[PDB]
Ligand binder design. Structure first.
Ligand SMILES: CCOC(=O)c1cc(O)cc(O)c1
Length: 470
């Protein structure tokens, strides 16, 4: 209610500890903070964790109470609700380990609870579909920045982090700072009267650019007709990890047809982006999906393999790589992709029967699911509606990156595993290049043999953060 003044009190912080790397790490915690005046869902709370030194006037890793970076991780996966995280949390989903390490590194951590596609209110109406996820992320950022100087850490040094859907969430927060589009939603929530532009973005395999992901996916996996992924089983746990029974299928001629068309459409979309290499040349693809852009994808995978090769890794686990002496000199991209295997069917994202997580994301209180591409809407196998064009645009990080804006985060670090088949490599690569082209700092790589995951290189993530903030 309006009784919630959204004023943080350091007095709320109580002492706790956790074991990390053979050491006891002491911190303080304030949990279950209602970060808007008018929440519609119980998940809309945030947890604050603070290195103990900052409540004793002291330093960690060159940081103080006033100057510490504020890492704002989220637990969003599959565009599902993301509960407020906790270094003590053991139930799925959680990046508790990351919080532990971050506190050890001297970062303030603000772990916000985020609505997702399955979230219902008191009446049982859906209130977590798009753009609830980013609205909540922004509202939590606004709470932190409103409470600058009351809350430990530098609110001008907010660094978001997330994996997959959560990576898109993090990238979107960095891209869309102070966007007028989200103002009516934030106002109706009673979010804090402050800005939501952030300092830096960490994103692991950001599942974004959803309206172009089907085209990118088929550009990559066309010619490969068997798909291999995972699906629900159960068994009672102690901490709710939803378990994955395998299922594989075989592309129908209808599917193959869509695939070939989708692949072709990707050339057109890609070319109109006017992406440039650092030499300044237009990155392109021809009608068959070959060209300088494909060569860039190939070079990043080659770079990935070389790093692994130099560490004694057997890169021939996958097919396609040419090694000449001590150098990965070339790559048969098609052979590699076939050895990697296709994961999703066709379309990969905007399914014709509205059964994808992204279909459900684009639903509303009235519609459980919607299409978000013209092709899937035209070829729908169920009665369906197209999601609003402005909404699709609003939750795509790329929409904001057509210029150097002061509202866009200046510092970006993006990773997508070289064994991650959940979206085309082209998707994070486009994001990476567009950032570079427009003058933003961008640290990008496709880490060797890394599956759909995140937070696996914390030592390098934290080194990157420290390079920015100290
Ligand atoms: C399975 C967890 O990762 C996700 O967040 C995710 C989200 C998507 O929209 C699609 C996907 O393959 C994974």
């Amino acid at each position: 209610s309006m009784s919630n003044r959204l004023i943080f009190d350091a007095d709320w912080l109580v002492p706790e500890q956790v074991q990390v790397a053979g050491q006891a790490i002491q911190y303080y915690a304030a949990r279950n903070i209602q970060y808007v005046q008018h929440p519609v869902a119980a998940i809309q709370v945030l947890n604050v964790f603070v290195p103990a030194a900052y409540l004793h006037g002291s330093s960690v890793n060159g940081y103080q109470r006033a100057t510490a970076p504020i890492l704002m991780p989220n637990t969003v996966g599959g565009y599902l609700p993301g509960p407020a995280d906790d270094p003590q949390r053991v139930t799925w989903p959680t990046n508790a380990g990351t919080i532990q390490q971050a506190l050890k590194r001297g970062y303030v951590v603000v772990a916000a609870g985020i609505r997702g596609r399955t979230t219902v209110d008191k009446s049982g109406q859906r209130v977590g579909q798009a753009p609830a996820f980013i609205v909540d992320m922004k509202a939590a950022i606004r709470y932190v920045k409103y409470n600058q100087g009351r809350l430990p850490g530098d609110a001008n040094r907010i660094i978001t982090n997330g994996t997959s859907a959560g990576g898109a969430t993090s990238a979107l927060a960095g891209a869309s700072g102070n966007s007028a589009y989200f103002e009516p939603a934030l106002t109706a929530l009673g979010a804090a009267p402050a800005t939501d532009d952030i300092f830096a973005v960490s994103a692991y395999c950001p599942i974004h650019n959803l309206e172009h992901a089907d085209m990118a996916y088929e550009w990559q996996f066309n010619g490969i007709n068997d798909w291999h992924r995972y699906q629900p089983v159960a068994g009672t746990t102690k901490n709710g990890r939803p378990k994955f029974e395998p299922v594989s299928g075989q592309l129908t001629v209808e599917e193959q047809a869509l695939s070939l068309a989708l692949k072709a459409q990707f050339s057109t979309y890609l070319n109109q982006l006017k992406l440039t290499a650092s030499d300044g040349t237009h990155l392109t693809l021809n009608e068959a999906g070959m060209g300088s852009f494909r060569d860039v994808v190939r070079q990043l995978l080659i770079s990935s393999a070389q790093t692994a090769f130099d560490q004694g890794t057997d890169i021939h686990k996958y097919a396609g790589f040419v090694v000449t002496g001590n150098q990965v000199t070339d790559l048969d991209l098609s052979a590699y992709l076939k050895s990697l295997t296709r994961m999703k069917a066709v379309p990969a994202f905007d399914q014709l029967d509205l059964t994808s997580p992204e279909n459900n994301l684009f639903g509303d209180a009235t519609a459980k699911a919607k299409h978000f591409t013209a092709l899937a809407q035209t070829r729908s196998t169920v009665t369906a509606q197209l999601a609003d064009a402005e909404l699709i645009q609003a939750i795509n990080p790329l929409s904001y990156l057509t210029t150097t804006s002061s509202q866009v985060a200046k510092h970006w670090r993006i990773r997508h595993g070289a064994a991650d088949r959940d979206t085309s490599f082209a998707i994070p690569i486009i994001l990476a290049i567009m950032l570079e082209n427009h003058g933003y700092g961008i640290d990008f790589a496709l880490p060797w043999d890394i599956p759909h995951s995140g937070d696996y290189d914390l030592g390098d993530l934290f080194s990157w953060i420290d390079g920015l903030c100290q």
